[PDB]
Amino acid sequence: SPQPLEQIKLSESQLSGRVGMIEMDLASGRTLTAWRADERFPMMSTFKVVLCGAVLARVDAGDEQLERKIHYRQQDLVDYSPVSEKHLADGMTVGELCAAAITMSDNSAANLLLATVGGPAGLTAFLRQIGDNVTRLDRWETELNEALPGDARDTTTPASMAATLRKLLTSQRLSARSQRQLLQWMVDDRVAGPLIRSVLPAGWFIADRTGAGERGARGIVALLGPNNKAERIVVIYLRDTPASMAERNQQIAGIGAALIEHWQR
Numbered sequence: 001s002p003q004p005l006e007q008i009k010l011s012e013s014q015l016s017g018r019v020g021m022i023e024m025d026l027a028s029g030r031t032l033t034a035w036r037a038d039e040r041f042p043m044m045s046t047f048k049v050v051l052c053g054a055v056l057a058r059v060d061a062g063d064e065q066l067e068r069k070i071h072y073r074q075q076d077l078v079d080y081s082p083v084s085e086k087h088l089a090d091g092m093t094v095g096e097l098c099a100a101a102i103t104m105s106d107n108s109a110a111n112l113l114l115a116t117v118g119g120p121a122g123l124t125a126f127l128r129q130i131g132d133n134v135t136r137l138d139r140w141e142t143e144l145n146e147a148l149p150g151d152a153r154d155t156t157t158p159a160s161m162a163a164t165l166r167k168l169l170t171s172q173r174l175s176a177r178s179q180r181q182l183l184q185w186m187v188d189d190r191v192a193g194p195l196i197r198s199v200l201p202a203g204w205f206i207a208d209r210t211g212a213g214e215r216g217a218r219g220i221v222a223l224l225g226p227n228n229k230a231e232r233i234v235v236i237y238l239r240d241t242p243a244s245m246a247e248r249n250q251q252i253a254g255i256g257a258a259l260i261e262h263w264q265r
């Protein structure tokens with residue numbers, strides 16, 4: 001694989017799409033690679049990590065409990081509810097909802113949690129309160145994945161999202177237990193985590209949340225590093241490409257390969 005920046009370029013030329021990428025040291029925030037890092041991309045289900053950070057902030061303040069059971073109705077469900085459709089009789093705890101959103105990309109779970117933080121406006125306000133003046137959520141699942149060309153709704157930038165993820169995981173805005181919980185949910189991703197491990201060399205840590213939307217939109221927010229350590233945040237978004245899902249996944253993986261082959265920078 002070529003140098004990371006060269007691979008990113010090659011991915012744009014092969015997808016005919018825009019890639020946005022950042023690579024950041026988790027502990028310090030040092031930016032190592034940046035490509036279109038101030039350009040907007042749809043978040044898609046990557047927003048679920050920020051969502052759960054807002055839930056955890058409420059827990060830390062005594063305004064929420066991860067134990068609290070929420071009962072909901074079949075008419076509350078939206079497209080793709082693998083966990084939540086199973087619990088119309090017995091409900092789900094707030095923490096179970098978080099786990100379903102982050103580890104399964106359960107859309108109804110995400111909407112249920114969005115309701116608890118004041119909807120898209122409430123989550124956007126939380127972002128502003130942690131110093132992210134760029135990321136915005138405007139819609140609910142699943143309309144937030146529409147990815148209309150040039151539409152600013154439901155977008156982040158790679159730089160914003162990486163900084164925000166670092167703030168949630170490490171800045172002591174959240175309690176120690178809450179930071180640990182958010183991290184564990186990402187470690188526990190079932191959508192992409194196990195597949196990614198199957199193709200990572202021995203020794204490489206992964207935690208992640210992915211997203212997918214229209215017009216080729218695809219993304220991942222990840223922690224990655226050698227020696228079984230979450231050394232770096234890696235944020236990659238794709239938009240406005242007609243390519244197959246397989247090829248979009250391959251190109252994201254190829255950027256990962258470039259990082260692994262050229263890690264010491």
Ligand SMILES: OC[C@H]1O[C@H](O[C@H]2[C@H](O)[C@@H](O)[C@H](OCCCCCCC3CCCCC3)O[C@@H]2CO)[C@H](O)[C@@H](O)[C@@H]1O
Nearest residue numbers: 196199200201220222224234236252253256257260261
């Ligand atoms: O010399 C470095 C390594 O080179 C290869 O490893 C390959 C591996 O065989 C391949 O499967 C992976 O694909 C990349 C898979 C990455 C998928 C997830 C990436 C995510 C992570 C962070 C967010 C962005 C994308 O590349 C590496 C590097 O070439 C060798 O197989 C391995 O023995 C050796 O240790």
